[PDB]
């Protein structure tokens, strides 16, 4: 098989290691209460939550993200980052996106300096802003609420405390062209077995497919299921329906969960990830 090192980034179990459409894949303590928490090792491209009018990045009542801090934590800027770290070397020069992973994981969760509870994410590459999410809860459907790849997303990465500083050579992001994932079999790439077919009218259309039926740490209201659904104010691993293969020419979404281990090259197929940007293509 000589597909091995190519198509290492696409074992998602393996590189990602948590849920896609909820990730709440580890739990830590707070001020002598666990909570549910996202650990996902990759960058989640494209994903935001859907709330009503108010749109999640809107701070949080005192929206999803931080409240104005003083001095001001999120949103901030990929060049205000950068300089707010300056004295530190092992994090001033990360990219944008582990930057914010790492920016986010340095606020003190509810004046617990003992706690290993980390808050997630969201960069958004069009103001190259990263916003602190506040609350790390993803779906509730008090707000009601579920994640998803809206087309207003797109330039948004959903991003765990555990994004790693390599995510750019071990994780998924562009679609590729040309390209239907596979299973390597008797020194030749073969279809999936077993695919569960839906249409789809664009790329897009297809990773929103694929991302709702991906891995999730949350199945789908007391303080019980509150925390349940990660609220602080049943893991995946990464086990899921994960891959998707389109059909440009009949507009069809193929998608699965086992692991592709190589590609056929067809024309008229591109290939893609829950995980993946849902319309940059390669």
């Given at each position: 098989n000589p597909w091995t090192e190519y198509m290492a980034k696409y074992d998602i179990e393996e590189v990602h290691g948590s849920g896609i459409r909820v990730d709440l894949g580890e739990d830590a303590e707070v001020a002598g209460t666990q909570y549910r928490l996202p650990s996902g090792k990759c960058p989640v491209f494209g994903k935001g939550i859907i709330i009503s009018n108010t749109t999640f990045l809107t701070p949080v009542a005192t929206g999803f993200a931080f409240p104005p801090t003083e001095p001001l934590m999120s949103p901030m800027t990929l060049d205000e980052m950068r300089h707010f770290y300056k004295d530190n070397k092992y994090v001033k020069n990360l990219d944008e996106l582990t930057l914010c992973s790492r920016h986010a994981g340095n606020m003190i969760p509810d004046?617990?300096?003992?706690?290993?509870y980390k808050y997630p994410a969201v960069y958004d590459d069009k103001d190259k802003k990263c916003h602190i999410l506040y609350i790390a809860a993803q779906e509730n459907n008090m707000f009601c609420f579920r994640p998803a790849k809206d087309i207003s997303f797109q330039n948004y990465t959903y991003l765990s405390?555990?994004?790693?500083?390599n995510w750019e050579k071990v994780c998924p992001r562009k679609n590729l062209q040309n390209a239907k994932f596979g299973l390597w079999v008797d020194g030749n790439c073969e279809d999936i077995p077993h695919v569960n077919e839906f249409p789809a009218i664009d790329l897009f259309e297809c990773n929103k497919l694929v991302f709702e039926l991906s891995a999730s740490d949350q199945p789908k209201l007391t303080d019980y299921e509150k925390i349940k659904e990660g609220f602080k104010n049943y893991k995946?691993?990464?086990?899921?329906?994960?891959w998707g293969n389109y059909n440009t020419e009949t507009q069809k979404c193929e998608i699965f969960n086992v692991k592709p281990?190589?590609?056929?090259?067809?024309?008229?197929y591109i290939a893609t990830t829950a995980l993946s940007h849902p319309i940059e293509v390669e």
């Open positions: 004046n617990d300096k003992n706690s290993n405390k555990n994004v790693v500083d995946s691993h990464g086990k899921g329906y994960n281990t190589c590609l056929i090259n067809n024309s008229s």
